[PDB]
Design a protein around this nucleic acid. Structure first.
Ligand SMILES: [Mg+2]
Ligand SMILES: [Mg+2]
Ligand SMILES: [Mg+2]
Ligand SMILES: [Mg+2]
Ligand SMILES: [Mg+2]
Ligand SMILES: [Mg+2]
Ligand SMILES: [Mg+2]
Ligand SMILES: [Mg+2]
Ligand SMILES: [Mg+2]
Ligand SMILES: [Mg+2]
Ligand SMILES: [Mg+2]
Ligand SMILES: [Mg+2]
Ligand SMILES: [Mg+2]
Ligand SMILES: [Mg+2]
Ligand SMILES: [Mg+2]
Ligand SMILES: [Mg+2]
Ligand SMILES: [Mg+2]
Ligand SMILES: [Mg+2]
Ligand SMILES: [Mg+2]
Ligand SMILES: [Mg+2]
Ligand SMILES: [Mg+2]
Ligand SMILES: [Mg+2]
Ligand SMILES: [Mg+2]
Ligand SMILES: [Mg+2]
Ligand SMILES: [Mg+2]
Ligand SMILES: [Mg+2]
Ligand SMILES: [Mg+2]
Ligand SMILES: [Mg+2]
Ligand SMILES: [Mg+2]
Ligand SMILES: [Mg+2]
Ligand SMILES: [Mg+2]
Ligand SMILES: [Mg+2]
Ligand SMILES: [Mg+2]
Ligand SMILES: [Mg+2]
Ligand SMILES: [Mg+2]
Ligand SMILES: [Mg+2]
Ligand SMILES: [Mg+2]
Ligand SMILES: [Mg+2]
Ligand SMILES: [Mg+2]
Ligand SMILES: [Mg+2]
Ligand SMILES: [Mg+2]
Ligand SMILES: [Mg+2]
Ligand SMILES: [Mg+2]
Ligand SMILES: [Mg+2]
Ligand SMILES: [Mg+2]
Ligand SMILES: [Mg+2]
Ligand SMILES: [Mg+2]
Ligand SMILES: [Mg+2]
Ligand SMILES: [Mg+2]
Ligand SMILES: [Mg+2]
Ligand SMILES: [Mg+2]
Ligand SMILES: [Mg+2]
Ligand SMILES: [Mg+2]
Ligand SMILES: [Mg+2]
Lengths: 46, 271, 93
RNA sequence: AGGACCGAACCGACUAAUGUUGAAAAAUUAGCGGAUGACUUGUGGCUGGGGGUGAAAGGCCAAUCAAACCGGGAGAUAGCU
RNA sequence: GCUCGCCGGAAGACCAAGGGUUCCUGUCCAACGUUAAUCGGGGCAGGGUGAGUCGACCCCUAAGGCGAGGCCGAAAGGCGUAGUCGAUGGGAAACAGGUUAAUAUUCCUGUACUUGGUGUUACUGCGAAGGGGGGACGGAGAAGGCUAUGUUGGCCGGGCGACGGUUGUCCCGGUUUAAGCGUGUAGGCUGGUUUUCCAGGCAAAUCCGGAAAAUCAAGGCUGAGGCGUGAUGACGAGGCACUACGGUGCUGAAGCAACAAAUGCCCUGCUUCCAGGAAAAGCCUCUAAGCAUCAGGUAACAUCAAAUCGUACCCCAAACCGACACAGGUGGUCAGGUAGAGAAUACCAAGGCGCUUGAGAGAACUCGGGUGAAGGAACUAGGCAAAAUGGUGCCGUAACUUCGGGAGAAGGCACGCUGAUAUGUAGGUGAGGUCCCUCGCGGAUGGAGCUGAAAUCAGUCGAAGAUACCAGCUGGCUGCAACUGUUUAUUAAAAACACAGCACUGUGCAAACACGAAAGUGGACGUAUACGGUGUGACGCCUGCCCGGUGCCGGAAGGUUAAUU
């Protein structure tokens, strides 16, 4: 059947991309948390 | 002309249409057109704020001269047209200086008839005058509430307003609802009624017809669970409560008008 | 006009393969490895200057580097640019 | 002409058998309903949790819903095992 | 390699989305592959994606987003103006043939096209952030004209048949050619031209709109296809030379017609209906400020430029989404033959496959199927399941009905092949030839050739002629719900929800109401023949009594009564 994940690069980057996170202070807190934890991959972008 | 369809299918059995062969059959006047994309009853928050609105046919907006301020120049009716945005028909008119406009079509107006607006126009349908110059007891439509603002009353198909009394700066009007309202005498109005008075005689016939007009289905409150409506619940069909809106306000008789600013212009409520 | 230093940096290596040899013997085309940011005009000017031959047209493509493994480690080779440079039929660089 | 008719694609899901450590965390096979419409489908967009949306089943909101998920208050409290 | 089997509106082909080297070549078989493996989408190494014309980028906007100032908000922020983004839509230009192990509309050959810059020559009113035109738009239906494509014939090359016959009214194969450029055709739309005047187009306008004459009565815009050319070229069945047996190389016949024909093209057309059917730019054209023997523009001609990014491969799937090499899911395009109404279905073509454990045996029992004496629902909660019906034409068809229906009611008859009517009919298409004119892609006539149903009469085979596949069971009484729809994704599809219709009630517009500390937004660019809420639920005949209780509506004499004082 049709499962819940249907990949779409445009929708993925618009929803969770670097510029989408940087656009609000809550997204910037997401990025700050992930930098503090030391994530190699900050967002989905690459 | 009210023509009812033959019952060649159950969806057609009860259909009663309104047909006007006098109405233009080609495209509308293009330079007076604008887009009006649909809302679904959603506001700028994206939330549904009016229920049961959605879909329907695509419509173009026709700019309609509700102000009728081109004063002095005679105009002639070119053709009567269908407007999807309102219940009344509209008339494309040509002024003697080559300017074309859309106006609301009064009853009786046909191609070739002469209209005029202004203080010095005559007493005949389609002519706009200040209500100061319109005799007491005339039938009018497209009435202004403030001088210069544009017609706001008696606009739908078949409606009119009566000038009951003129006294000083104000005129007393009897509205279609039966309310007696005062308006400034400088406010303009058009002689005659709004045409297409047969609009109320139509019968849609089927659910799809209401869907074509952008009206989504209504679910009764008594048909749902108590979490999502005050009427909800019941083992079987139960009510046991005073009817309310979905937000709890009594919905059979409770008055909701609350406007002290405009109370001084209501001579008598519709009752 | 492209400076001489730039032109000296744009050309990297003459690409070697069977297809490149065949291009040389059939269409008088040499194939080169160039700078990732080198444009067609920069490559044309650099070939005409540094190799002293007449070019009419240059064809470029970017190659993707391959993912590999080195003792279970995930690595990747770099992208690079390859140039198909056609010479005006009398040069044999 | 038609929310007309029979019937493929397409959309759905009425019966039965199989399967039930499945080929499948909802399918297969034989039949079944709609099939120019209140139809169906691609792409993108908006509505956010006592909130949404709901032709209304407390349905659905990422295999989760009489109050999603993730982190925190947090070693909640547990006269109970 | 030879046979056999399977798909062939797919199990072939080509793409988008998604993936990202899975592509090709050499090599290796530890692990991976549900077995072995010399094989692999596995390991390792190397190679492989070539663009002015395809796409992105770019220009333009939709929904929507962001948003200088601004409005609003304890703060964080919210909304929004000018703007600026945002395709799933509008905007310039390339085709055929060849070629690699792997790319090709990108390389090569042949033949084309577009936009823009610079220059030179010749003529000249050029000029926008402003005006106008255009771009520019729905559903259904009908007809004609075409092509894609196919079939047959002519032509050309080859054949004379493993077993009776096969020099013919025989067998096999081929018989292809583009964009561009000229022609402007079937057909579609529109009356032209030249003057004078004007309350309109935020000012000006020579443009658009309006008005009045004169003049001719045909001019203009669009347009599939064909024809010519492109092409003395390319491709070509087959032959002949090597073969390193993978194929390379050379040559090269015919390359015509008729009929049939799309759901594709003319056609964004035409007819018709209501539910009345994007935007903005490119584009064409008006002028304002301003330049004015200059710039600018028109035409021609030469010359330069057209960057950058993608391009391999899979793509109804072993490479995407489902933990798997998973009977699941996944948008668009292409569309041969025989039969058939058909994109159903059966067998085939092109093409692609035999599904990554096999070998035996031929117990019970399970699963999927076939047949069955006599009986025929006796089974069972229940005809569950199965059996049955099933096509076309024609005859015929009841109660009841809202006059449409019911109805494919029910029921029945005919149906293959051969000959004749008729060496091939009705119909369709249509060459020659004759003639007419404003000479053409004209017109009138004329009919060779090609194609071609259906019916009647007579014969004839079989148990059986709608012979396979495919393909309604029918009727009688009654409950509920008017009907088509909708629903518990994953045990409920219903009598439940919705529905057209009906009633009550609120709402006078800065509407009621809803979302929001607010600003605002929706309702609505609507205005009581409108909008919101509530109940009922097509239609027909109807809808009785009670205002004590609770709610709402109205009233304001009297009692009681807050802050405050
Ligand atoms: Mg409503
Ligand atoms: Mg209703
Ligand atoms: Mg319920
Ligand atoms: Mg409640
Ligand atoms: Mg009860
Ligand atoms: Mg009771
Ligand atoms: Mg090139
Ligand atoms: Mg490239
Ligand atoms: Mg139907
Ligand atoms: Mg469903
Ligand atoms: Mg099935
Ligand atoms: Mg049906
Ligand atoms: Mg059907
Ligand atoms: Mg769920
Ligand atoms: Mg709770
Ligand atoms: Mg605590
Ligand atoms: Mg604990
Ligand atoms: Mg205890
Ligand atoms: Mg790999
Ligand atoms: Mg391979
Ligand atoms: Mg071994
Ligand atoms: Mg093994
Ligand atoms: Mg491999
Ligand atoms: Mg915007
Ligand atoms: Mg904003
Ligand atoms: Mg600001
Ligand atoms: Mg933009
Ligand atoms: Mg696009
Ligand atoms: Mg390939
Ligand atoms: Mg043809
Ligand atoms: Mg069709
Ligand atoms: Mg490719
Ligand atoms: Mg397998
Ligand atoms: Mg699978
Ligand atoms: Mg599908
Ligand atoms: Mg089939
Ligand atoms: Mg057996
Ligand atoms: Mg059995
Ligand atoms: Mg049997
Ligand atoms: Mg028996
Ligand atoms: Mg028997
Ligand atoms: Mg019997
Ligand atoms: Mg019994
Ligand atoms: Mg019994
Ligand atoms: Mg049954
Ligand atoms: Mg059966
Ligand atoms: Mg016969
Ligand atoms: Mg009973
Ligand atoms: Mg029903
Ligand atoms: Mg139904
Ligand atoms: Mg269920
Ligand atoms: Mg079910
Ligand atoms: Mg408002
Ligand atoms: Mg009811």
């Amino acid at each position: 059947m049709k499962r819940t994940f249907q990949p779409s690069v445009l929708k993925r980057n618009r929803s969770h991309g670097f510029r989408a996170r940087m656009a609000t202070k809550n997204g910037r807190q997401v990025l700050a948390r992930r930098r503090a934890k030391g994530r190699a991959r900050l967002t989905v972008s690459k | 002309a009210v023509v009812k369809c033959k019952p060649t299918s159950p969806g057609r059995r009860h259909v009663v249409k309104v047909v006007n062969p006098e109405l233009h059959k080609g495209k509308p006047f293009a330079p007076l057109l604008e887009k009006n994309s649909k809302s679904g009853g959603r506001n700028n928050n994206g939330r549904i704020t009016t229920r049961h609105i959605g879909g329907g046919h695509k419509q173009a907006y026709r700019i309609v001269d509700f102000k009728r301020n081109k004063d002095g120049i005679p105009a002639v009716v070119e053709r009567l047209e269908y407007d999807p945005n309102r219940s009344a028909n509209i008339a494309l008119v040509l002024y003697k200086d080559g300017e074309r406009r859309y106006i609301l079509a009064p009853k009786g107006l046909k191609a070739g008839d002469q209209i005029q607006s202004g203080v010095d126009a005559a007493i005949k349908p389609g002519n706009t005058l200040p209500m100061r110059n319109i005799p007491v007891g005339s039938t009018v439509h497209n009435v202004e509430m403030k001088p210069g603002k544009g017609g706001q009353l008696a606009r739908s198909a078949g409606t009119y307003v009566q000038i009951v009394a003129r006294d000083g700066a104000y005129v007393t009007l009897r509205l279609r609802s039966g309310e007696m309202r005062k308006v400034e005498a400088d406010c303009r109005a058009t002689l005659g009624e709004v045409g297409n008075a047969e609009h109320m005689l139509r019968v849609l016939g089927k659910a799809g017809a209401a869907r074509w007009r952008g009206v989504r289905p209504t679910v009764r409150g008594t048909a749902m669970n108590p979490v999502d409506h005050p009427h909800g619940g019941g083992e079987g069909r139960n009510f046991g409560k005073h009817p309310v809106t979905p937000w709890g306000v009594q919905t059979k008789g409770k008055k909701t008008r609350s406007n002290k600013r405009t109370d001084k212009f209501i001579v008598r409520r519709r009752s | 006009m492209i400076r001489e230093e730039r032109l000296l940096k744009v050309l990297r290596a003459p690409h070697v393969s069977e297809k490149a040899s065949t291009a040389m013997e059939k269409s008088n085309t040499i194939v080169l490895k160039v700078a990732k940011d080198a444009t067609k005009a920069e490559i044309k000017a650099a070939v005409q200057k540094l190799f002293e031959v007449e070019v009419e047209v240059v064809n470029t493509l970017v190659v993707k580097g391959k993912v590999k493994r080195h003792g279970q480690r995930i690595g990747r080779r770099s992208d690079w640019k390859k140039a198909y440079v056609t010479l005006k039929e009398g040069q044999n660089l």
